[PDB]
Design a protein around this ligand. Structure first.
Ligand SMILES: [Mg+2]
Lengths: 1337, 98, 79
RNA sequence: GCAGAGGUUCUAGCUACACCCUCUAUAAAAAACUAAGGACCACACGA
DNA sequence: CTCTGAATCTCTTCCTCGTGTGGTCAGGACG
DNA sequence: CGTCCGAAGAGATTCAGAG
């Protein structure tokens, strides 16, 4: 219907145009009669008639009298709904500043005038006079002059000089100033002054002035002469409550504002003394401030119940504001709620639903069908028929529920699968029945959990619900390719009990014709459910070109595993049902079924497996009892040993051999050892103790105990959750987190001591409070993630970009956390992968890596695969399908259009509730060892030493893959050589953790140059070996006398001539910094790789993810080499040491300040490339993006957040993190304007500058260069081109103020904009409509 | 708490804060995000416009369903008009281009 | 009756244009007197449209050309 | 059946979301029928 | 003496839906 | 019968160290 939305500063004439009148009486209504006040806030003439086409007097009461006002009262007669849009204005006697521009953080009014805000709101509050047009005076146009100084000026500036005060005075200033003149005046100060901070302030002023010379806005408009009022129906009298008519809302603020305005009018016409008039003007200013934004001053005006009364800005911001309460998400009709019920008889495509709920929700449909069939002539009679619940109504109801999906909806819809469609099955009752499989997807319990049901109305709505939202269409969660409808708790236990074996069970040994015979034997009761019997199966495989071949063989198995064979579809092999079939096995089964058979066979197989699991779990009778949890017989002796050990430790501490700290550490260690021992004893008693024969003498099998079956199967439970039942509960921590010295030895099968239960409830309360805080933190993170997203949809199909990220299996010192098979699956490569054979196109350039390709990758032993990343995509206002990859919910490429920003945000934020809050190098296995970027010189010991700093051991096996990766500290000696085969279990590199060696690159004679004993390095004594060792004094500790001279170590030969670096004219000098112990004195020869000086030397929870996504700089940021070159030092650590890096070829205009306490891994004789770390500690993403590139920072953040998610046992595909990061760094800064219109200081969206410079480079012109910058989610979201999106997120007042100053027009084009407006969403079915609309323009 | 049509609120959000008062359940911001994640732009649009606050839209949808033609007359949410009036009343002209 | 729309989306590889085309088909069936080509089995319009798409005889191109022909004989009705 | 009135009932009924018939300045042979308002703050609880 | 970095001060939220209750400008008398 | 009175981080704002 309508084009883009624009926002601008409201001109007073525009306000007059808006208003259909002018309110004068403060009074709203009469109580004598609910008729509105003649000139009050509720008024008929100003805002239209109260009743539908009736006047106040009632002279005209029919529709034919529309468009004519009354006579005695002169009120227009029209619809009452017109009263919801007619506005009015208040003619303020004295102009009042708008608080939004006044008390803004940047202070629009103050910044525009380039004067401090203290002065501004001093002159607003009538306690200091500004000097309008000072002219031929000492005082200037922008000058403060309080009462006494004003009198001092007045008594001797009695000329025509005038210095107005108040908001009128600032209006005078704003009128006097010319915006263009100020811009051209400040341009030369911008071009001249070299101060960074000062120029930053000048640009901020220039931006404000430019945003007013471009937009049709006048600076004077900020001061508001007329105050608009809302339509009365938007701020009504509130329900009568028996005539009480009372609520502290806008009506009250408007009443007080009108009262003050009338008082000012009376005083102005009365010519009251200036002090009283000034006080009343201050009161009016405070009233307008409270009206617009209450709480933007010290005292928030308070209504009844002594609470801040909601203002005109409290209803546009916050959770209860109009945006997030009525636009972003709004209540809906055709909706009902009830507790949920299992109802296993249902299929996941359908759900149970009460008759009353179907009758109430589908009332219009029932009325329509009744009218069509003629059962009721009219809607009114049909409605009565629905009330009578006549039997004919139920038959009609069954017709409108045949194929009408409903949207089951749980309240905390964390992710996409929170709401799913279902075909309602009419059930008698009052509880909605939810299919058991989708409970895991819903994260829904059956403990009073309630979920709303919504009824799609239009054919488009029902049809898209059926096509997309059906549980049949949602098998794989959007977070990862793993199935989401997997048998979760009880059916998995039934399958696990089904697929086991006794070594001697009834009916074991005989051969079975097939699964039918197995079912016949089990049901007849003459053969046990799980007995090892050979069966004949017709296994079907599709190894042909889609054709299924039949293989018949006698596979040894059990009866229970044979039962499942008739359930599985034809394509699945028998090797998947021949195991114990725990939770992981069933998940792998369902994934293979989805990837082989498809979707419909997977749905049918899931339903059948659910049926059989439930049925045979019922037949199993897998109960729980006291005898089912066994106490280890060795638990008593383990407890006795632990008590003896703690007694010995306490006795040692009493003597004084061990102090408190080491005693505490020893006790904790020995109690942990006892806990591990008792846990192992419990597991042995729970899975090994079972003794059962084989018709022979004796045999031992895996236990059939109830708790072991319910825990090992993965049905429900874990290692700690089973330890806390039979074994020692373990050391339980205090509130602060420090461990109680004495653990809760007693388990839950036995009783607990009162102190033991006190520690237990300490831990439980800590966990409950942690969960209560963590769910709120995760909700906030999900909101931020969604809103930094929601403008990113798959707009194209391909971009032809060769860029991407090189996907490599992640190694964090240990084993392979995620193999490349599960890391690149579903993503489209960027360049051809090759096997060890070179120039081999194993996988072509632009083929999606499905299961077959990934399986081929593993057997070809690939190491690193370059893949097209969503970050590297060059598509504007979206990304292409190929750069994203698989949908992760359907086995194909992402559909052109589907919104992936919201999918990624929900996938990231869903596990937020599941998160938390608080040497030597040894080879592991056999394999080759090669080093990357390594410089080594053979020493006299035959070992290997490293000259580079980022040498990093990668362990290559005989397959060519990197089994292990270890970081090599500088100077660490390597026992083995390059490419030397090593056997797992022996250390290859070892070093002193508290020592930084200065090992020499080339052996030879070293002369002590600039070494003075007494001034630079004092010869300290030694009380340990008897031979003194030279220790270099610290620069801060040593005086300036020994500080000016530069310590150095010159290398010479036997003839005394200097030795130069191989290939470098610079001699191999070495600098010794402070605190460097030099055992080797002068005249001592040094071999290669010999140490010269022995220089001596976190969170992973939800807050870590929040910091990572907000791009928070760490408390101790790691310094990275901004430029590549040699290192030089400047100041003598005068408070802040400065470091300068100069390249061999280029200039050195970069200087960095480094505090003394920061450890430096770099010296002044080595070459460091750009991005190499200098200090130690966490590195901010901003520096990584600036130096190492966008791909490097994307990889860093993806790896960090995945490692955070790894510890909690939750897996999220890296594409979600990648797209969120792409949305994070969508802003760019133009370092050189070039020929583009963009200014240098200006930062613009990367899409804008990319489009502009690609257009400029399309022809002979040269495009402008830019510098991309990374900013946090909560900062990228507000800093967006859409004002209506940033306003809806956070800081609504600031965003709206900046938009109104800018005059910027929102073009919609984002999911959340079109949601707020209420039009089609450019995400799914609306994407085609939006692209048609664009192509029609 | 099942409901089809009932009395509406000040902002004209039809469900009227569901309780004893006959109400519809708040299709909150999380559920809107969930539909956005799906390829849903018709059910979401209908349930954020013609099912909640569009007075002309609501009347037309009711008349259409009782007619048997489940056709959505989109219109515009009245909550957005309320927001426009509230932002204008602050003194910030926010309007639409035709 | 139908449970899943898989074969339909292998017929129409968009999963989004499928909804639009089947919605147009359902609109033709309800608002117009159009007879569904697959005979119904006590099925609603929104699912019989998906049944029509499943057999492959109804999609965006066939629907567009069919409505274009109907418009053509609509001009030709008055000669 | 769109601007009004009348009719057999029951003050009033003209599509008000709304139910039957008449015509453009005139009132009755006629059974099924009728109503279109409604906030915030706190508490407790559930998931 | 004028900015530099740094301490200080101020703003801006800090989940998402339900179900029961209860309390809320309060003009007041005079032409 | 009507009518007039913790907490956590970011950014602006001082504010300060050093030549
Ligand atoms: Mg539950």
């Amino acid at each position: 219907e309508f084009d883009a939305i624009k926002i601008a500063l409201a001109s007073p004439d525009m306000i007059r145009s808006w208003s259909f009148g002018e309110v004068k009486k403060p009074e709203t209504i009469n109580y004598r009669t609910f008729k509105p006040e003649r000139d009050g806030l509720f008024c008929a003439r100003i805002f239209g008639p109260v009743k539908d086409y009736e006047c106040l007097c009632g002279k005209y009461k029919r529709l034919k009298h529309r468009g004519v006002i009354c006579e005695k009262c002169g009120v227009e007669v029209t619809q009452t709904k017109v009263r919801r849009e007619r506005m009015g204005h208040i003619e303020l006697a004295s102009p009042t500043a708008h608080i939004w521009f006044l008390k803004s953080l940047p202070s629009r009014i103050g910044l525009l005038l380039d004067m401090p805000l203290r002065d501004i709101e001093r002159v607003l509050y009538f306690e200091s006079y500004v000097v309008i047009e000072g002219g031929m005076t000492n005082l200037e146009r922008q000058q403060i002059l309080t009462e006494e100084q004003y009198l001092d000026a007045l008594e001797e500036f009695g000329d025509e000089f005038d210095a107005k005060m108040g908001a009128e005075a600032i209006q005078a200033l704003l009128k006097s100033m010319d915006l263009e003149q100020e811009c051209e005046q400040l341009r030369e100060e911008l071009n001249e002054t070299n101060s960074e901070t000062k120029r930053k302030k000048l640009t901020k002023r220039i931006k404000l002035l430019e945003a007013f010379v471009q937009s049709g806005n006048k600076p004077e408009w900020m001061i508001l002469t007329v105050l608009p009022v809302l339509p009365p129906d938007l701020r009504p009298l509130v329900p009568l409550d028996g005539g009480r008519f009372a609520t502290s809302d806008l009506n009250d603020l408007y009443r007080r504002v009108i009262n003050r305005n009338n008082r000012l009018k009376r005083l102005l016409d009365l010519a009251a003394p200036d002090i009283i008039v000034r006080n009343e003007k201050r009161m009016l200013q405070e009233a307008v401030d409270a009206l617009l934004d209450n709480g933007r001053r010290g005292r928030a005006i308070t209504g009844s119940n002594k609470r801040p009364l909601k203002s005109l800005a409290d209803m546009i911001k916050g959770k209860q504001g109009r945006f997030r309460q009525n636009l972003l998400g709004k209540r809906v009709d055709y909706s009902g709620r009830s507790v949920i019920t299992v109802g296993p008889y249902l299929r996941l495509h359908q759900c149970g639903l009460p008759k009353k709920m179907a009758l109430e929700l589908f009332k219009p449909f029932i009325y329509g069908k009744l009218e069509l069939r003629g059962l009721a002539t009219t809607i009114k009679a049909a409605k009565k028929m629905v009330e009578r619940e006549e039997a004919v109504v139920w038959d009609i109801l069954d017709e409108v529920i045949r194929e009408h999906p409903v949207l089951l909806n749980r309240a905390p819809t964390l992710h996409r699968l929170g709401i799913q469609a279902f075909e309602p099955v009419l059930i008698e009752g009052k509880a909605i029945q939810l299919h058991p499989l989708v409970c895991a997807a819903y994260n829904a319990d059956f403990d009073g959990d309630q979920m709303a049901v919504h009824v799609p109305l239009t054919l488009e709505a029902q049809l898209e619900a059926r096509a997309l939202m059906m549980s049949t269409n949602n098998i794989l969660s959007p977070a990862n390719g793993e199935p989401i409808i997997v048998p979760s708790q009880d059916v998995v236990l039934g399958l696990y009990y089904m697929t086991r074996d006794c070594v001697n069970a009834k009916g074991e040994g005989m051969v079975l014709t097939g699964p039918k015979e197995a079912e016949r034997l089990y049901r007849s009761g003459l053969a046990s459910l799980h007995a090892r019997v050979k069966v004949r199966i017709t296994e079907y495989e599709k190894d042909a070109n889609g054709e299924l071949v039949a293989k018949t063989s006698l596979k040894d198995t059990t009866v229970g595993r044979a039962i499942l064979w008739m359930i599985v579809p034809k394509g699945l092999p028998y090797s998947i049902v021949n195991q114990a079939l725990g939770k992981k096995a069933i998940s792998k089964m369902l994934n293979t079924c989805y990837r082989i058979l498809g979707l419909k066979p997977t749905v049918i197989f899931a339903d059948q497996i659910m049926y059989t699991g439930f049925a045979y779990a019922a037949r199993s009778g897998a109960s729980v009892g006291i005898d089912d949890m066994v106490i280890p017989e060795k638990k008593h002796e383990i407890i006795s040993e632990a008590e003896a050990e703690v007694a010995e430790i306490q006795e040692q501490f009493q003597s004084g051999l061990v102090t408190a700290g080491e005693r505490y550490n020893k006790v904790i260690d020995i109690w942990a050892a006892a806990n591990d021992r008792v846990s192992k004893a419990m597991m042995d008693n729970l899975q090994t103790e079972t003794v059962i024969n084989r018709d022979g003498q004796e045999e031992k099998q895996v236990s059939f105990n109830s708790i072991y079956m319910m825990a090992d199967s993965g049905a429900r439970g874990s290692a700690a959750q089973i330890r806390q039942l039979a074994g020692m509960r373990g050391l339980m921590a205090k509130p602060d987190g420090s461990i109680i010295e004495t653990p809760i030895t007693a388990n839950f099968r036995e009783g607990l001591n009162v102190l033991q239960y006190f520690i237990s409830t300490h831990g439980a309360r800590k966990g409950l409070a942690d969960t209560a805080l963590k769910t709120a933190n995760s909700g906030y993170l999900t909101r931020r993630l969604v809103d930094v997203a929601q403008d990113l949809v798959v707009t194209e199909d391909d971009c032809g970009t060769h860029e991407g990220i090189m996907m490599t299996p992640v190694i964090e010192g240990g084993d392979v956390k995620e193999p490349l098979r599960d890391r690149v699956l579903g993503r489209v490569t960027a360049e051809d992968v090759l096997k060890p054979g070179t120039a081999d196109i194993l996988v072509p350039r632009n083929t999606l890596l499905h299961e077959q390709w990934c399986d081929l990758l593993e057997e070809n032993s690939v190491d690193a695969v370059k893949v097209r990343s969503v970050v590297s995509c060059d598509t504007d206002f979206g990304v292409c399908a190929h750069c994203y990859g698989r949908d992760l919910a359907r086995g194909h490429i992402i559909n052109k259009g589907e919104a992936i920003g919201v999918i990624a945000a929900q996938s990231i934020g869903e596990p937020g509730t599941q998160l938390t809050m608080r040497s030597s190098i040894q080879v592991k296995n056999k394999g080759s060892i090669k080093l990357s970027n390594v410089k080594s010189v053979v020493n006299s010991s035959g070992k290997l030493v490293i000259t580079s700093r980022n040498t990093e051991l990668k362990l290559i096996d005989e397959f060519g893959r990197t089994k292990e990766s270890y970081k090599v500290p500088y100077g660490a000696v390597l026992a083995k050589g390059d490419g030397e085969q090593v056997a797992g279990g022996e250390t290859v590199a070892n070093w002193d953790p508290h020592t930084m060696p200065v090992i020499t690159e080339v052996s030879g004679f070293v002369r002590f140059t600039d070494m003075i004993d007494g001034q630079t390095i004092t010869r300290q004594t030694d009380e340990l070996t008897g031979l003194s060792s030279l220790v270099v004094l610290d620069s801060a500790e040593r005086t300036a006398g020994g500080k000016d001279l530069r310590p150095a170590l010159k290398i010479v030969d036997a003839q005394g001539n200097d030795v130069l670096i191989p290939g470098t004219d610079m001699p191999a000098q070495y600098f010794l910094p402070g605190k460097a112990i030099v055992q080797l004195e002068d005249g001592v020869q040094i071999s290669s790789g010999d140490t010269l000086a022995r220089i001596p030397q976190i969170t992973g929870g939800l807050p870590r993810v929040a910091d990572l996504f907000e791009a928070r700089r760490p408390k101790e940021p790691a310094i990275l080499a901004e430029i590549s070159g040699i290192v030089s030092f400047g100041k003598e650590t005068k408070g802040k040491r400065r470091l300068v890096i100069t390249p061999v070829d280029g200039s050195d205009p970069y200087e960095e300040m480094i505090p003394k306490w920061r450890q430096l891994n770099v010296f002044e004789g080595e070459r460091v490339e750009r991005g190499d770390v200098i200090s130690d500690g966490p590195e901010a993403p901003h520096d990584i993006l600036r130096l190492r590139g966008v791909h490097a920072v994307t990889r860093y953040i993806v790896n960090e957040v995945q490692d955070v998610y790894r510890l909690q046992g939750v897996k999220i595909n890296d594409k979600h993190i990648e797209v969120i990061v792409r949305q994070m760094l969508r802003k760019a800064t133009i370092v050189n304007a070039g020929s583009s219109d963009f200014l240098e200081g200006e930062q613009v969206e990367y899409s804008r500058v990319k489009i502009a410079n690609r257009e400029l480079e399309a022809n002979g012109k040269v495009g402008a260069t830019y510098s991309r910058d990374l900013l946090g989610i909560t900062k990228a979201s507000l800093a967006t081109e859409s004002f209506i999106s940033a306003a809806s997120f956070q800081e609504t007042t600031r965003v709206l103020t900046e938009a109104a100053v800018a005059g910027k027009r929102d073009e919609l084009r984002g999911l959340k904009e079109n949601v707020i407006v209420g039009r089609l969403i450019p995400a799914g079915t609306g994407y085609a409509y939006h692209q048609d609309r664009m192509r029609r323009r | 708490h099942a409901r089809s049509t009932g009395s509406y609120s000040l902002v004209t959000q039809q469900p009227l804060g569901g309780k004893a008062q006959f109400g519809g359940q708040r299709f909150g911001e999380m559920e809107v995000w969930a539909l956005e994640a799906y390829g849903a732009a018709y059910t979401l649009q209908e349930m954020l416009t013609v099912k909640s606050d569009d007075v002309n839209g609501r009347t037309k949808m009711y008349k259409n369903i009782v007619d048997g033609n489940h056709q959505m007359e989109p219109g515009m949410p009245e909550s957005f008009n309320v927001l426009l009036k509230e932002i204008r009343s602050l003194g910030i002209n926010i309007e639409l281009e035709d | 009756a139908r449970v899943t729309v898989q074969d339909a989306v292998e017929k129409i590889g968009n999963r989004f244009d499928l909804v639009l085309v089947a919605a147009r088909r359902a609109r033709q069936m309800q608002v117009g007197g159009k007879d569904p080509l697959v005979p119904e089995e006590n099925d609603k319009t929104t699912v019989i449209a998906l049944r029509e798409i499943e057999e492959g005889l109804i999609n965006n191109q066939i629907l567009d050309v069919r409505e274009r022909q109907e418009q053509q004989e609509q001009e030709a009705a008055e000669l």
